[PDB]
Amino acid sequence: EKLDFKITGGWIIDGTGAPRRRADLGVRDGRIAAIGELGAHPARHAWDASGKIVAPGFIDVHGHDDLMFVEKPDLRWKTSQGITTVVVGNCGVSAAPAPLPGNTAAALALLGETPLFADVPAYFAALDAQRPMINVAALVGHANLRLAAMRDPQAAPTAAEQQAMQDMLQAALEAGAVGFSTGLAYQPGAVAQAAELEGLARVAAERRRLHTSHIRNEADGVEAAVEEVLAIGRGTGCATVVSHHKCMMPQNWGRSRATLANIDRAREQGVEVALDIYPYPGSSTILIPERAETIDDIRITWSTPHPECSGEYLADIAARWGCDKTTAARRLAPAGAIYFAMDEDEVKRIFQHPCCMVGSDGLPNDARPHPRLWGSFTRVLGRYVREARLMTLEQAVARMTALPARVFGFAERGVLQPGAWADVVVFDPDTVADRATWDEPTLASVGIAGVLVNGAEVFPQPPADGRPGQVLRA
């Protein structure tokens, strides 16, 4: 039978870590039909990958694009960097379930202004009706759970409220969620104690689902914070992921030696533990006034009362207004910012850990976003692999494909093998690179030649109508 698509003349890096090999790839009915010599095989569509690498589409394990499938459906910031699948609902905040009327959280604003969904089934129904550009897997946020179950989300939960959150989690998992996420460094999640988190972890563990976590503190208390979530995994057996692992502030640079060692002790004991990073020494989230006097070069990404301040340094704003930086930050609220507080050499060492995946952590709603939104994966390929030689291209591709699929349980994805879904990316290994900078954070990558999602082209030319992305129901 005629192939729907064929990619010939290139070198395949299938995600297994095996050395690249010269071979063609054929696609039929959304899946990889064959791999080998297809030069003379008839195909409806054909791509010449001569001089390029043909690999599995990249899986962004740390997305916050929950509401973008309806707000900004193009998802060009993903496809332009080779991403074919994204895991949303991270750091305790997700599209569903909806908070109780009146209950809110600063971190939720980062997802966008679209009213949140009632529950996971409602969210997935919306995605089924308006198919996403790329595949979407979803985690349920602990913040959402607390905001949906507690009339006072700043209190300790009653036995009934704890059970309510567990029941909501169970429902979400039955609906297809891949697990739940926590944002322990943010309200209301920070209020949670071990019993509350372990209770939710037991529900996920029972169904072989995940607990991805933005730990309690990533600065002075980073080691204890890692220990806290590892203790949960150890005691419940729940597969765990340490989100955007890092060490903030000069006095904490180098502590990854200790945190990674603890992570190793945990996985040696049988607990499934992984982590992810974005390739930059600056973080980005809501503007936190308490940081105004401890971190220099805080750059505003957005501000509701002062939208003219996006892209400006807090110090320059405060100087102009004639007030101290803390006062200026309070006047900018609600707002978001970028914090340059990590050691890039350490970021690289963390990425080298065998269980580290790539998570862009892009904030698509930001007026002047952190460039990781558009350049994370290509920065890894161009700067971490080609420029720094932190690992081979074959190893890096595995971290972006097969590893994520294994950690999140995505059957028939993350690898180029017959029968698997045809999520494919074709790129030039010598030119692939990010172009997004701190000043111009939305510049598209170079070196990405084409991207297929379930066998359909999404890059460089997006589909005219219905998009190829699928909801990855666990």
Ligand X SMILES: CP(=O)(O)N[C@H](CCC(=O)O)C(=O)O
Bridge partners (DSSP) of residue 12 are: 21, 54
Taking residues 233 to 262 in sequence order and writing x for each that binds ligand X by CB under 6 A, - otherwise, the string is -----------x------------------
Among residues 110 and 453, whose Cβ is nearest to ligand X? 110
Q: Which entry of ligand X, Zn ion, none binds 175, CB below 5 to 8 A by partner kind?
A: none
Rounded to the nearest whole angstrom, what is the least distance from the CB of residue 365 to ligand X in the complex? 11
Contacts of 41 (CB under 8 A, 6+ apart): 3, 6, 26
How many other C-beta atoms lie within 10 A of the C-beta of residue 231? 15
Taking Cα atoms as reference points, which of 361, 436, 437 lies closest to residue 107?
Answer: 361
In this structure, what token pair is assigned to residue 415? 């690898």
90 binds Zn ion (CB under 5 A): yes
User: Is 445:80 a contact under the CB 8 Å cutoff?
Assistant: yes
Whole-number Å distance between alpha carbons of 354 and 413: 20
Taking Cα atoms as reference points, which of 124, 178, 117 lies closest to residue 144?
Answer: 117
Q: Which entry of Zn ion, ligand X, none binds 283, CB below 5 to 8 A by partner kind?
A: ligand X
Q: Which entry of Zn ion, ligand X, none binds 161, CB below 5 to 8 A by partner kind?
A: none
Rounded to the nearest whole angstrom, what is the least distance from the CB of residue 31 to Zn ion in the complex? 32
Among 87, 91, 133, 452, binds Zn ion (CB under 5 A): 91
Taking residues 277 to 306 in sequence order and writing x for each that binds ligand X by CB under 6 A, - otherwise, the string is ------xxx---------------------
110 binds ligand X (CB under 6 A): yes
Q: Which entry of Zn ion, ligand X, none binds 259, CB below 5 to 8 A by partner kind?
A: none
Among residues 162 and 212, whose Cβ is nearest to ligand X? 212
Among residues 136 and 415, whose Cβ is nearest to ligand X? 136
Q: Which residues of 52-91 are buried (b: 16+ CB within 10 A; e: fewer)?
A: bbbbbbbbbbbbbbbbbbbeeeebbbbbbbbbbbbbbbbb
Q: Residue 454 carries which DSSP code? A: T
Among 13, 53, 91, 332, binds ligand X (CB under 6 A): 91
Among residues 4 and 366, whose Cβ is nearest to ligand X? 366
Among 4, 65, 198, 361, binds ligand X (CB under 6 A): 361
Could you tell me which stretch among 66-74, 138-146, 162-170, 357-365 binds Zn ion (CB under 5 A)?
A: 357-365
Among residues 132 and 371, whose Cβ is nearest to ligand X? 371
Q: Which entry of Zn ion, ligand X, none binds 339, CB below 5 to 8 A by partner kind?
A: ligand X
Whole-number Å distance between alpha carbons of 404 and 407: 5
Rounded to the nearest whole angstrom, what is the least distance from the CB of residue 421 to ligand X in the complex? 27
182 binds Zn ion (CB under 5 A): no
User: Is 362:379 a contact under the CB 8 Å cutoff?
Assistant: no
Q: Which entry of ligand X, Zn ion, none binds 435, CB below 5 to 8 A by partner kind?
A: none
Taking residues 199 to 228 in sequence order and writing x for each that binds Zn ion by CB under 5 A, - otherwise, the string is ---------------x--------------
360 binds ligand X (CB under 6 A): no
CA 248 to each of CA 213, 219, 277, 348: distance values in angstroms, whole numbers, following the listed order: 16, 5, 13, 14
Contacts of 19 (CB under 8 A, 6+ apart): 394
210-214 and 239-242 beta bridge pairing? parallel
Q: Residue 116 carries which DSSP code? A: P
Among residues 245 and 467, whose Cβ is nearest to Zn ion? 245
Bridge partners (DSSP) of residue 282 are: 340
Among 6, 20, 78, 214, binds ligand X (CB under 6 A): 214
216 binds ligand X (CB under 6 A): no
Contacts of 321 (CB under 8 A, 6+ apart): 328, 331
Q: Residue 111 carries which DSSP code? A: G
Among 77, 339, 374, 427, binds ligand X (CB under 6 A): 339
Among residues 149 and 338, whose Cβ is nearest to ligand X? 338
218 binds ligand X (CB under 6 A): yes
For residue 303, report the phi and psi dihedrals to the nearest 5 degrees.
Answer: -160, 125
For the chain, how big is the Rg over CA atoms in Å? 22
Q: Which entry of Zn ion, ligand X, none binds 399, CB below 5 to 8 A by partner kind?
A: none
Peptide bond into 404 cis (omega under 30): no
Tell me the HSE value of 334 on the side-chain side, using a 13 A CA sphere.
10
User: Is 343:256 a contact under the CB 8 Å cutoff?
Assistant: no
Peptide bond into 250 cis (omega under 30): no
60 binds ligand X (CB under 6 A): no
Among residues 370 and 435, whose Cβ is nearest to ligand X? 370
**In the window 385-424, what residues touch ligand X (CB under 6 A)?**
none
Contact set with ligand X (CB under 6 A): 91, 110, 185, 214, 218, 244, 283-285, 339, 361
> Rule CB under 5 A: which residues touch Zn ion?
90-91, 214, 361
